[PDB]
């Protein structure tokens, strides 16, 4: 049952601006088989597996460029920098003596 939702966000606005400039139409659809992508038993799933199996042309979202994916799918230029970062709660500040 292909129920219809409403999609918006940072990447969607980029997709709209791209569509006007490159003059192409689109029909987004969310994933059902996994997310983003992972080569399980040699098969790509998620957002990156639906471009591999020719189910769609592009995968607009939070996909990160890496060597493993770029060998099976063509990645555009990075429209935002990301990476790996560690998130922790703040520590207890200590006022140094002799202040």
């Amino acid at each position: 049952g292909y129920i219809k939702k409403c999609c918006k966000g940072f990447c969607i606005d980029i997709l709209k601006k791209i569509s006007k400039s490159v003059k192409f139409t689109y029909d987004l659809y969310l994933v059902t088989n996994g997310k983003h992508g992972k080569k399980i038993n040699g098969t790509w799933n998620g957002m990156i597996g639906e471009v591999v199996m020719k189910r769609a042309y592009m995968a607009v979202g939070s996909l990160t460029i890496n060597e493993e994916r770029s060998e099976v799918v063509d990645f555009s230029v990075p429209f935002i920098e990301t990476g790996i970062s560690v998130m922790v709660s703040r520590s207890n500040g200590t006022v140094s003596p002799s202040a």
Binding site: T94, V95, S96, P97, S98, A99
Partner: protein, 43 residues
């Protein structure tokens, strides 16, 4: 955004524990001079 200044500083001990080290050091140092000046008087 830039963090606003955190006013209403209650100024607990940990803020001022350095000063009490100075008073504690003088308390110990003055005792040493007290012992030192007794040795000077004795000899």
């Amino acid at each position: 955004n830039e963090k606003n200044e955190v006013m209403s500083s209650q100024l607990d001990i940990d803020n001022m524990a350095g000063v009490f080290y100075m008073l504690g050091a003088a308390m110990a140092l003055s005792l040493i001079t007290f012992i030192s000046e007794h040795l000077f008087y004795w000899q």
